[PDB]
Subunit: 307 residues, 4 copies
């Protein structure tokens, strides 16, 4: 029986081997509370702590399972998918319903979560998210509904596998480079570059973007309209901010599809970076990491076409 | 034949479409000519006033418009148009010069819809990719796909095949002539901005708006309308002083619900239901022309 | 508190289970009682009582269960505030649309089921059950036709279908969307069906003892016409074709159906494609062959309407008007 | 430029050969074209399938890649057949139109440009047979028609597309895992007919006649479009259990459009000799069953086949 480590970052999602005695029939389960906060307050600090831990105790066990809140689970998963160097399955799991309500999704999610982490096939596929009998990759997965237990879907490329009765039928694996193939190492960092997001919409104010420049942010991510477009005010503010070193990334408020390279905006003339299929939140995770390597817009783009 | 007035706000989306002479006597006039990413309050008031002013001179209106903020203009017109004739919007996701451009057939179908007597009393309508969609619920789901506009929470109202519409639904929230919103006497609208939530979110953006005396702030929260700590503080205090705060969500479907995760009564906050951040901004604005009391905005937010 | 009656048709979707035959009235009654006890919270929103009308897996649903359910609901209308019917998920969408068409009662009738065994981890039964009761007890659910409540969403009997084989979120209205969503015991209703249902249809099954025979044939590359010929040779009143694309037919299937239609069999062209309408005279010249186009109705659902239409008329044009009204 | 062979199977999907209808075609490849057949896809059949496979596997060495024009109705069926039987390693891309070529906003022209664009990409190879529709690249195993009239109807409903196409460039982030093309034991080059496989539908009060008729005419295999996770109406179950006994191959699939029919979940497969088709819908599963029947009539082995391709 495999040894599996459950790393908690918050409250319990089930009720732990007491809560779900079935866990004992699939693996040797050990657990440790790494931190305790709501996911809406997730930060650089916790992020760095988790990747560090995973990298540290990586040889001490056969796989990890991370309980996390759902609010920003898509952010954390992507950051780990980029920064973890361990070659053992790292699986994230949460619950849409409180462990004390009727029909709590937590226990079964957990069990499937463990099952996934403990399957030899689950290795080498990146940081994984297991929700609603589905295995999802940390890159494409995202929360598509506010309350539904089925909210987590890889909206662009789809799931990796499905789980029935503790058996998984994998029929896909991600192509973009992840984990041990990324040049990203935070083992040595204590803080990450400052990157923020601004939203576009009709009559968009420039203050938010201006306020970010004046605080000297390293990076700004634009959640544009349509295929990455920006409202006049935001555009001007960002283009000058792209000439004073601030790395500017064009992404989109639209939940599926890519923000293509020089199509709607002449990225070249201004030095903007197109996020591709990464939503504002994810594009932010990648800008942050790239800004610990280079500061060259032409080099950040190449990063966005690879990871 | 019916008389149809096309109101253009941008470049063409077709080319024209000779088949249109088969369904209506079509008239048109440019109103503005901008990409929709720079759409603003001015164009809005202008479109509404015109619609309400020429309302009797036509059998129905068709508005050509860019796809980026269509869902925003649609809802505003949905709340402010007092005309009882069909108002329908169309765009094209492909340039008219392109192979397999969608604009031409989209426009045809748009006119078909405005010319159908059954299209009345349904609110402002968006017609794309052979589907009729209501102003409130429609949003852009994909950056480039021709089938991008979907009513992701409650579904479409009708589908069009060979020029006829199978209508099986009608929006229940109040719209057009049933709203207390009159923008005729207006030349300006309350200032409402939007801030995004995410891990480590900065409170600067939220701070800047407050410092500029914005009338209202819409939060695009994480999950069911939750806020990152810093943002939460800034916004809680801001509400104490008289700023209208609306919790909406960055998550594309599902409602941001009243008092589930955040204690709305305690902090003077408003929950937007199924309105996304950008649509939530539209109703908050108009709401601000009526009241400023949180419980009254909340009730407006439950009605329209 | 409202009085809600639960009519069960199969296994228990919440709790531990009996293993009882439940053919005995008294025992069936005790079986629905154990449900209330399995979901204590049900006591805070309604006085719940009930009985076991039948007990079969839903793969074995049949005309007889339907005539019974319909008659029962129509008969007990006065005695209660609303109905909640527990049903297996396999053919839930068929039963819902039959009731949607034959129920004359004006109180809410709501169907509910579960994709997970009630003894399973994270069983969905209990909460579906609770939310069905909430829906049945809400005065705003009145007049919306028969309803299916699953996974916090209120659905209408006409458009609802099962989209996935095992997902708890499988029930969706794939063409027109849901009617309302339930958060914390409250329903956000923003739509209501526009097609006539329940008391506004002319279908009365109250004196009926059996229904016209209607079967379904599938189309695919190289399809055989034997299945179609079998239903005709047995004298079926009607045949529904699950066609390819916009209701098209494979060559051999067309030939058989053309003759069937000319000699008394009612023929409805539907589609195996899970969303969108099979439209009149688009891909097939319906008027020349005497065929009916099903609209957004899928094969199973179109079967349900063709049966009812055949109690009224056997004329294709009249039947076609019916597929356009219900 | 690559030499791309457009094989057409019906009317033209562009034009109000196709090279003059889509001038842009010439910027990206050398187009040669033959009309292999001219039927509407609702009449697609075993003979055309046998013909198409042999063709591609014949002229494999003579070109850089294939673009097959096909009606939408059974596209998803041919796609899978050719996915189990093509032996070429060059890209074989399928494509069609949901709107008539003479139509306003016809989709055929751009669809075609993109199929050619797809067949010419060095990346598009070793991914199985492909179906390119509406700016998307889909494998022939999961792709299926989702709506009766929507130009966007083709989706791989269980696993997602292989890539997206913008301005002539493909962003591939997925390749199909199941074995396809050259890695399959399935060889049709010496065949003239395929085993006889039919489909029966399940629903409330379902008749057993359709099933009985296939059995009595001695079909080799039958595919059940079941309810839920492949379950069967009583009467149909019965007829089917005996059929297996009489040596008929029986595969449980589902009328439900997504998700998998699981083995020994709702029906005791071992007890009756049934095979559960997994994520294969009833018409995709007939294709695999026919092929598998050209190697074995053993249930346990057919199953295993449904678990590999």
């Amino acid at each position: 029986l495999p040894n599996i480590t459950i790393l908690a970052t918050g409250g319990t999602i089930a009720g732990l081997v007491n809560a779900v005695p079935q866990l004992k029939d699939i693996a040797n389960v050990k657990g440790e509370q790494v931190v305790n906060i709501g996911s809406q307050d997730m930060n650089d600090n916790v992020w760095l702590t988790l990747a560090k831990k995973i990298n540290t105790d990586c040889d001490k066990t056969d796989g990890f399972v991370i309980t996390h809140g759902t609010e920003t689970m898509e952010e954390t998963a992507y950051f780990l998918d980029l920064t973890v160097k361990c070659d053992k399955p790292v699986v994230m799991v949460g619950a849409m319903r409180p462990s004390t309500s009727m029909s709590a999704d937590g226990p079964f999610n957990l069990y499937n979560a463990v099952v996934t982490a403990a399957d030899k096939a689950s290795a080498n596929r990146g940081v994984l998210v297991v929700m609603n009998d589905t295995v999802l990759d940390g890159r494409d997965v995202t929360k598509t509904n506010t309350t539904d237990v089925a909210t987590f879907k890889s909206v662009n490329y789809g799931p990796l596998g499905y789980i029935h009765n503790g058996k998984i039928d994998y029929q896909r694996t991600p192509a973009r480079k992840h984990t041990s193939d990324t040049p990203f190492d935070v083992s040595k960092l204590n803080e990450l570059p400052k990157v923020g997001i601004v939203y576009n919409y009709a009559n968009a104010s420039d203050l938010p973007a201006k306020a970010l420049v004046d605080a000297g942010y390293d990076g700004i991510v634009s959640a544009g309209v349509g295929n990455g477009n920006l409202y006049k005010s935001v555009f001007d503010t960002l283009a000058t901010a792209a000439k004073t070193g601030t790395a500017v990334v064009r992404s989109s408020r639209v939940p599926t599809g890519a923000t293509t390279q020089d199509a709607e905006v002449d990225d070249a003339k201004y030095g903007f970076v197109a996020s591709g299929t990464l939503n504002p939140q994810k594009a932010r995770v990648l800008l942050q990491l790239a800004l610990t390597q280079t500061k060259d817009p032409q080099q950040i783009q190449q990063i966005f076409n690879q990871y």
